[PDB]
Design a binder for this molecule. Structure first.
Ligand SMILES: *[C@@H]1O[C@H](CO)[C@@H](O)[C@H](O)[C@H]1NC(C)=O
Ligand SMILES: *[C@@H]1O[C@H](CO)[C@@H](O)[C@H](O)[C@H]1NC(C)=O
Ligand SMILES: *[C@@H]1O[C@H](CO)[C@@H](O)[C@H](O)[C@H]1NC(C)=O
Ligand SMILES: *[C@@H]1O[C@H](CO)[C@@H](O)[C@H](O)[C@H]1NC(C)=O
Ligand SMILES: *[C@@H]1O[C@H](CO)[C@@H](O)[C@H](O)[C@H]1NC(C)=O
Ligand SMILES: *[C@@H]1O[C@H](CO)[C@@H](O)[C@H](O)[C@H]1NC(C)=O
Lengths: 49, 137, 49, 50, 99, 49, 99, 49, 50
């Protein structure tokens, strides 16, 4: 599962967590078996302007 | 190493790489003091296993206590009566002192005559409440 | 020799109280056992020469 | 107020809806001790201080 | 009062039930003694752990109650087999046994 | 006996009691005779790790 | 604070909420809408955050003004005070009788 | 042994051995009474006379 | 951590109690046999065989 979020929502990408993203965009199950991968992408995604 | 207890002098010998000792590996029996190199063995603060022989609460409120496997001269040392309440100091020592093989019994009046007994004390001693009225052993 | 003993007792001492009651009952029934095997008659006759 | 003299405010007799706080700001740290953030809706609170 | 043995049985049963319910009164090292507060405040990925601790404590308590009832039942069988022997030897016939 | 039995009325017999009578009042700390402070500053301000 | 500082020196406004869970009548809580009360039926209930299943009856107990949740034996909440109507309802579990 | 010290009890870490209700001397006196009674009086030892 | 250690120690004590249960049952059986022999064979004559 792939998406793009800000820096304050990587904590919200976690099981048993609240927030705007967890409630309304992407929710993880309580019995989740997996790995969450996240890194900064200010270079390629964020263009000038 | 933090804890609550009473420490005595010990005759153990410690190896130079050993500071903490365990005889039975659940409690530290002895420690070497950091300032003075003497070895002090730590014993629990409250010990001796006091048992209270009593009649029913409906009958009377006066009780007698037995300290298991102690000597009668070492009862204030064993129970640490100086930090206890003065109510507990009445059962620490007094006029009635009976020394049994089971332990030192304080709080009952010893009688030479013998009857059939209903309170099992142990070591050939029994208790009953009939004699004012006081607990007899 | 714990630093906190009151909290430990009020959270886990009733188990030991029940087990100590069980051992006390065992001790009492052992005393009654030696009573009932050796004291069937409560009469003391001196051994004659 | 500064951290050496923190301000304590009593909150009572209202509705603790934190869903409206989504648009106001994004919280970098939000940790609940002794209570779960997901179960924060279906509970009622005796005394609340901020 | 000389019927101390029957009153003793009643008192031991009473003390066993009282000790059991006061064992259930404990919290067993959880955030709350009552199950509803634990199930209400915490979400499943640690509410299940807290409920696990509470259920393990309650099961240990009830099994210790079973252990005490074993002592009681053993003594009851000793006395009751003695009673049945005394019955069938003494009221249904004459006994040559001594004392 | 009332506290260990969790009842305000006790019956006739012997009872074993847990320790509810003594509480510590004073505290002692015994540490080795060490005076000099550690070179934590010297390590931490190092110009090149 | 200077706007040119790094993130480690940027301002961080902190609001800490301290609250006690289910020991008193509740003045403030969340957005869930209240519903009707179904007495003498097995129903999932939520009384001031106390969730569970059971059947509730009318009770004759009296509550002190600082007491909202009651326990007889300290592991089950015997009775609750309803937040809307001040009557005291004692909650019993749904399945019982010991068939 | 009934002559044990309390140092063995703290070695046990709380485990204690209570002495029996009947002393071995009293058991010997009971056995002597039984032997003298049976050898002198027969089975009238049990009836009581 | 103290809960884990105390739970282990309490389980050890309870297993000791259940072992004492086996010992007490066997001892009570043998002692009841001894009391029967005291009632029969020393205070009287036994018509029981072997
Ligand atoms: C530790 O220092 C104190 C204070 O000078 C001194 O009294 C004590 O003897 C010292 N202990 C040693 C040297 O073991
Ligand atoms: C003792 O018990 C009797 C009944 O068994 C009761 O009438 C009496 O009031 C009781 N006394 C006390 C002091 O509890
Ligand atoms: C108790 O102390 C007295 C003091 O003389 C001594 O005679 C006695 O033997 C001691 N008893 C035990 C059991 O050590
Ligand atoms: C009991 O026996 C002891 C033995 O020395 C004696 O001193 C005491 O006076 C006796 N007490 C009574 C009441 O006979
Ligand atoms: C680092 O701190 C030590 C003191 O612990 C001091 O002696 C040293 O001069 C300091 N070095 C620098 C580069 O600040
Ligand atoms: C709560 O509000 C409802 C809706 O207005 C009303 O019917 C009910 O009587 C109120 N309860 C009170 C005032 O206790």
């Amino acid at each position: 599962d792939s998406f793009v979020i800000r820096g304050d929502e990587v904590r919200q990408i976690a099981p048993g967590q609240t927030g705007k993203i967890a409630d309304y965009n992407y929710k993880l199950p309580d019995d989740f078996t997996g790995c969450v991968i996240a890194w900064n992408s200010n270079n390629l995604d964020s263009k000038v302007g | 190493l933090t804890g609550t207890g009473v420490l005595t002098e010990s005759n153990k010998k410690f190896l130079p790489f050993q500071q903490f000792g365990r005889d039975i590996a659940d409690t530290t029996d002895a420690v070497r003091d950091p300032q003075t190199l003497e070895i002090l063995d730590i014993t629990p603060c409250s010990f001796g296993g006091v048992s209270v022989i009593t009649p029913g609460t409906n009958t009377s409120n006066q009780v007698a206590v037995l300290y298991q496997d102690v000597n009668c001269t070492e009862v204030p040392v064993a129970i640490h009566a100086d930090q206890l309440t003065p109510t507990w100091r009445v059962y620490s020592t007094g006029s009635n002192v009976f020394q049994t093989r089971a332990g030192c019994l304080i709080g009952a009046e010893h009688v030479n005559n013998s009857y059939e007994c209903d309170i099992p004390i142990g070591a050939g001693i029994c208790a009953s409440y009939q004699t004012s009225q006081s607990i007899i052993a | 020799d714990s630093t906190e003993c009151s909290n430990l007792l009020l959270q886990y001492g009733s188990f030991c109280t029940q087990l100590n009651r069980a051992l006390t009952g065992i001790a009492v029934e052992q005393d009654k056992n030696t009573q009932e095997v050796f004291a069937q008659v409560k009469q003391i006759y001196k051994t004659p020469p | 107020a500064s951290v050496y003299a923190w301000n304590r405010k009593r909150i009572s007799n209202c509705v603790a809806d934190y869903s409206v706080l989504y648009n106001s700001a994004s919280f970098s740290t939000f940790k609940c001790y002794g209570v779960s953030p997901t179960k924060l809706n279906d509970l009622c609170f005796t005394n609340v201080y901020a | 009062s000389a019927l101390g043995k029957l009153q003793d049985v009643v008192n031991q049963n009473a003390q066993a039930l009282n000790t059991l319910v006061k064992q259930l009164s404990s919290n067993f090292g959880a955030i709350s003694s009552v199950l509803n507060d634990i199930l209400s405040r915490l979400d499943p990925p640690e509410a299940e752990v807290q409920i696990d601790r509470l259920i393990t404590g309650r099961l240990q308590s009830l099994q210790t109650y079973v252990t005490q009832q074993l002592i009681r039942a053993a003594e009851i069988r000793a006395s009751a087999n003695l009673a049945a022997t005394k019955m069938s030897e003494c009221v249904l016939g004459q006994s040559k046994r001594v004392d | 006996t009332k506290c260990t039995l969790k009842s305000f009325t006790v019956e006739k017999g012997i009872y074993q009691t847990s320790n509810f009578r003594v509480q510590p009042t004073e505290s002692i700390v015994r540490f080795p005779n060490i005076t000099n402070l550690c070179p934590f500053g010297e390590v931490f301000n190092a110009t090149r790790f | 604070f200077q706007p040119t500082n790094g993130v480690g020196y940027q301002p961080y406004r902190v609001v800490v909420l301290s609250f006690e869970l289910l020991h008193a009548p509740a003045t403030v809580c969340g957005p869930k809408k209240s519903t009707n009360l179904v007495k003498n039926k097995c129903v999932n209930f939520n009384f001031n955050g106390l969730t569970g299943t059971g059947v509730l009856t009318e009770s004759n107990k009296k509550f002190l003004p600082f007491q909202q949740f009651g326990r007889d034996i300290a592991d089950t909440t015997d009775a609750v005070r309803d937040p809307q109507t001040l009557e005291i309802l004692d909650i019993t579990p749904c399945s019982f009788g010991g068939v | 042994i009934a002559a044990r010290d309390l140092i063995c009890a703290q070695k046990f870490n709380g485990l204690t051995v209570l002495p029996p209700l009947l002393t071995d001397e009293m058991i010997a006196q009971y056995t002597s009474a039984l032997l003298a009674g049976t050898i002198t009086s027969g089975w009238t030892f049990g009836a009581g006379a």
